[PDB]
Design a protein around this ligand. Structure first.
Ligand SMILES: OC[C@H]1O[C@H](O[C@H]2[C@H](O)[C@@H](O)[C@@H](O)O[C@@H]2CO)[C@H](O)[C@@H](O)[C@@H]1O
Length: 461
């Protein structure tokens, strides 16, 4: 009897190649047609290619241009060279031979089947974090397993993720502070995390609470973040302990062609500490001072992340407000910088919002157990968090083993000093609408459209 035996089925990266071969126990000269069919999980039989005894090859539109069907009558084998592979190609590939016997009737022959998996582990993390370091962890993952790990940093990913992941494929894992994850959890865009006790015990029990929505773990905690006052020790050795003495320092510094403080005023995360310093009366008091700085021409109206970072790094401003991640770019510049407590306002301290960088698995991903492996056994490790921290600092990492190395850093001490004066963000689904209401309120008052009293009116609604 005639029997078809397929081979060449394995895992590859999108763009890579695979050569399937289907050998028979008889002469291919007797077969009229030979061809390859594919069946993905829970789908119908799909013909990809075929070759007739008359040497004419036909293909399907998806594989056309990428796959070629070859035949070797010596080796009694038909071949499918698959090049420039994609995740859509993934399926169990089957070989097929049709034989017209001496009489009118024919004989269809089939084989065992060969599995072909085109897998890619794609990660979404903000461009202000250590993505090159996260890629080095990803490169160590592909060495030990064989799965490609591409790291992406698209703009507005906090609001691009729920639109793309809901409809399209999106990423396998999403990295963002824990506050945005309650909205993703309510919407049903995140798979429930089920980590073993041994792994759970490696991180601080307080970090696991931040990534918990309605008694379910929705992400893996990476590190604790908190804004701090970064200052040039050469332009300013004894920096301000209070916000109210900055205008005086700016008058002193503008005479020498320098600014006192430049920080991102567009994003409300950076203005919120001053706004929530006293408290309402505390928000009105806090925002009026911020408006007075711009009204007195001390701070520019459209001060964004790029022109504030560049200004501090160039040595044009004496101070700036930024997180752990920002230190690597200052180290690169020739600036003798210092990280310290945020200035006090009306005697009380500025209360920043404490974020917990967390990795959540996308609910609409087929690579859930592969991402768990990556997050647990490779990223959340002493070696994995080191590779990320040396690119761009993570902040006070959630990993228990790092406690001594974090306690040796003068800047992590200033970050924890500000984190204690601040408070952790509630993960609730309303955070998105809240953050939008504060973002608009600050921009309107900064530019000069709405009054400080009318800003809190529209924001409280
Ligand atoms: O600005 C509002 C924005 O603030 C926080 O985002 C931070 C993020 O947590 C940090 O890790 C860093 O990337 O900067 C972001 C601000 O530029 C909140 O997490 C986010 O919800 C909110 O939109």
């Amino acid at each position: 009897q005639r029997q078809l035996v397929e081979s060449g089925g394995g895992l590859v990266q999108p763009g890579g190649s695979l050569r399937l071969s289907c050998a028979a126990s008889g002469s291919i000269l007797y077969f009229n047609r030979m061809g390859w069919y594919r069946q993905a999980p829970g789908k119908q039989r799909e013909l990809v290619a075929a070759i007739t005894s008359g040497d004419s090859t036909n293909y399907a539109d998806p594989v056309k241009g990428r796959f070629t069907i070859s035949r070797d009558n010596a080796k009694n084998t038909v071949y499918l060279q698959m090049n420039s592979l994609k995740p859509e190609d993934t399926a169990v590939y089957y070989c097929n031979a049709k034989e017209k016997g001496w009489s009118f009737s024919l004989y269809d022959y089939w084989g065992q089947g060969t599995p072909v998996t085109v897998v890619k582990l794609v990660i979404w993390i903000n461009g202000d974090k250590g993505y090159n370091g996260l890629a080095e962890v990803g490169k160590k993952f592909e060495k030990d397993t064989g799965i490609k790990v591409t790291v992406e940093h698209p703009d507005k990913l906090e609001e691009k993720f729920p639109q793309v992941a809901a409809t399209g494929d999106g990423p396998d894992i999403i990295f963002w502070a824990h506050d945005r994850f309650g909205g993703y959890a309510q919407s049903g865009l995140l798979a429930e995390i089920t980590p073993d006790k041994a792994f759970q015990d490696k991180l601080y029990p307080f970090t696991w609470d931040a990534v918990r929505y309605n008694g379910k773990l929705i992400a893996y905690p990476i590190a604790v973040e908190a804004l701090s006052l970064i200052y040039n020790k050469d332009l300013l050795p004894n920096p301000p302990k209070t916000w109210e003495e900055i205008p005086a320092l700016d008058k002193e510094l503008k005479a020498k062609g320098k600014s006192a403080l430049m920080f991102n005023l567009q994003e409300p995360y950076f203005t919120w500490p001053l706004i929530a310093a006293d408290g309402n009366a505390g928000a009105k008091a806090g925002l009026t001072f911020l408006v007075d700085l711009i009204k007195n021409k001390h701070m520019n109206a459209d001060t964004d992340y790029s022109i504030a970072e560049a200004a501090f790094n160039k040595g044009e401003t004496a101070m700036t407000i930024n997180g752990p991640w920002a230190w690597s770019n200052i180290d690169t510049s020739k600036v003798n910088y210092g990280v310290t407590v945020l200035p006090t306002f009306k005697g009380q301290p500025s209360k920043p919002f404490v974020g917990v960088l967390s990795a959540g698995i996308n609910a609409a991903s087929p690579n859930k157990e592969l991402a768990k492996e990556f997050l647990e056994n490779y990223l959340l490790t002493d070696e994995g968090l080191e590779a990320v921290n040396k690119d761009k600092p993570l902040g006070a990492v959630a990993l228990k083993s790092y406690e001594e190395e974090l306690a040796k850093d003068p800047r992590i001490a200033a970050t924890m000093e500000n984190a204690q004066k601040g408070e952790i963000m509630p993960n609730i689904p309303q955070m998105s609408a809240f953050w939008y209401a504060v973002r608009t309120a600050v921009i309107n008052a900064a530019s000069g459209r709405q009054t400080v009293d009318e800003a809190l009116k529209d924001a409280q609604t």
